[PDB]
Amino acid sequence: TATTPQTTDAPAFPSNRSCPYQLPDGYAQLRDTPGPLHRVTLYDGRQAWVVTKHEAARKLLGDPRLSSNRTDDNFPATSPRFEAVRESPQAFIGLDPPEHGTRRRMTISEFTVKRIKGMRPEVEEVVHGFLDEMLAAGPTADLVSQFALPVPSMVICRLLGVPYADHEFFQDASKRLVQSTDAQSALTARNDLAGYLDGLITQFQTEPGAGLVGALVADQLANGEIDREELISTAMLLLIAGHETTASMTSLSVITLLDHPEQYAALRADRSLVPGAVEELLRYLAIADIAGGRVATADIEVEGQLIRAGEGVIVVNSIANRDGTVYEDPDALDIHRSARHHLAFGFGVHQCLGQNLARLELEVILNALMDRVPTLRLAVPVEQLVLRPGTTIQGVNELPVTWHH
Numbered sequence: 001t002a003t004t005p006q007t008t009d010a011p012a013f014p015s016n017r018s019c020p021y022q023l024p025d026g027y028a029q030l031r032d033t034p035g036p037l038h039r040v041t042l043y044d045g046r047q048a049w050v051v052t053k054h055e056a057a058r059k060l061l062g063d064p065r066l067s068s069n070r071t072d073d074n075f076p077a078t079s080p081r082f083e084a085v086r087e088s089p090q091a092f093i094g095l096d097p098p099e100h101g102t103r104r105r106m107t108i109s110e111f112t113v114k115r116i117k118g119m120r121p122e123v124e125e126v127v128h129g130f131l132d133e134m135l136a137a138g139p140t141a142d143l144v145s146q147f148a149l150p151v152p153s154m155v156i157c158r159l160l161g162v163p164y165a166d167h168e169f170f171q172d173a174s175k176r177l178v179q180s181t182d183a184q185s186a187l188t189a190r191n192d193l194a195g196y197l198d199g200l201i202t203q204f205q206t207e208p209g210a211g212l213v214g215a216l217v218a219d220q221l222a223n224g225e226i227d228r229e230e231l232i233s234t235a236m237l238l239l240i241a242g243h244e245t246t247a248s249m250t251s252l253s254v255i256t257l258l259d260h261p262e263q264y265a266a267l268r269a270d271r272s273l274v275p276g277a278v279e280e281l282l283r284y285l286a287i288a289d290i291a292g293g294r295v296a297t298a299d300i301e302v303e304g305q306l307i308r309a310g311e312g313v314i315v316v317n318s319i320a321n322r323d324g325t326v327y328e329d330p331d332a333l334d335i336h337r338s339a340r341h342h343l344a345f346g347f348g349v350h351q352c353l354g355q356n357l358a359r360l361e362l363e364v365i366l367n368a369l370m371d372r373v374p375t376l377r378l379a380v381p382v383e384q385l386v387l388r389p390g391t392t393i394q395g396v397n398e399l400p401v402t403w404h405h
């Protein structure tokens with residue numbers, strides 16, 4: 001057996017959070033080490049680079065030599081989930097220019113500032129309805145299942161034209177896919193969603209209807225400009241991202257705000273601070289490092305360090321968002337700071353399609369919680385919560401809460 005010291009210069013990555021709003025201990029070390037890049041070891045023993053500094057992260061996310069192609073043999077997979085989805089065509093999150101733009105542009109019209117503004121009545125109605133329901137159902141609740149997840153689920157389903165009557169099926173399948181720890185469970189969940197979306201497509205060909213899925217069927221599919229299987233993958237990406245991200249931000253924001261009561265009280269007293277507070281929470285909670293993987297198709301020199309063609313690179317936006325040369329006192333939550341330029345949504349051609357929908361949702365959500373349940377508090381200590389591992393979207397699967405009856 002091993003009898004020598006075990007220190008490594010390529011630590012295992014990713015790490016798991018122990019506190020919902022602080023860097024894992026190993027990540028603070030990466031944050032402090034000079035240089036834009038650091039070697040890490042992935043779950044299968046393969047070495048990859050992580051990007052740990054803010055401007056270097058923007059530069060590399062903007063560099064077309066870093067490909068988003070998940071089918072590449074050298075793509076930096078962080079768990080066995082990745083190996084599962086090989087047979088299926090990728091959604092545009094896994095495409096590079098020029099194919100990336102042709103597919104992304106098929107969906108952008110649903111996310112314009114004008115459409116998002118027009119969605120405010122629906123978002124407010126959905127938020128207040130699930131809130132009406134949770135407050136009436138009992139003195140305590142799981143915020144996740146009763147509020148954080150159904151709200152963005154109903155909103156994105158309406159945008160897509162996915163009937164919410166099937167929500168128990170597709171919400172469960174979405175959870176199994178993003179939180180899968182092995183390839184087989186991931187493949188099963190993906191096939192479940194694919195079969196469901198396939199049936200929805202056939203129905204739109206018979207009976208044209210509203211929503212982005214209906215529009216893609218009636219236009220691009222009918223012109224042969226998207227493959228049926230690509231349409232499934234695109235709808236699946238938007239469905240899952242639209243659900244899982246906002247839900248995680250809601251639950252983690254509640255935990256974080258309750259641990260910072262002075263700032264939460266200031267937020268309640270001046271609602272003009274909400275948009276800025278949402279940006280700070282996005283920066284600080286950075287829930288989507290899982291989306292930072294890239295593979296180099298050519299050598300890239302980064303401040304003296306060399307990324308070789310064929311090497312995997314993960315842009316760790318949570319660490320980059322704690323860069324003190326950009327955010328003074330970066331580990332402090334400050335809803336009054338300028339959190340502009342943060343990387344929680346990425347940067348460049350793949351920058352989050354839904355970012356302004358997410359911003360609208362989180363603004364409406366925080367205002368609604370402060371208006372309708374100002375006495376909201378956790379029903380258990382923070383120590384008793386269970387955080388998801390760094391191999392998935394950050395968050396909590398259950399969040400017990402209570403309030404003044």
Ligand code: HEM
Nearest residue numbers: 093238241242245246288291344345346350352353354358
């Ligand atoms: C709520 C907080 C959210 C966070 C923190 C977040 C984070 C991210 C990040 C970091 C990326 C970049 C992936 C990459 O560079 O490979 C991304 C892309 C994307 N996100 Fe978001 N997201 C959020 C909400 C949403 C919502 C509500 C939707 C609605 C469907 C959405 C849809 C997408 C899509 C489609 C992409 C792929 C864009 C592309 O490849 O061109 N996201 N997101």
Ligand SMILES: O=C(O)c1ccccc1Nc1cccc(C(F)(F)F)c1
Nearest residue numbers: 093094236237240241244245288291
């Ligand atoms: O990344 C894929 O290929 C993907 C595929 C199908 C469904 C969802 C997918 N991605 C995903 C799932 C949840 C959250 C986010 C993101 F963080 F990027 F928004 C991306």
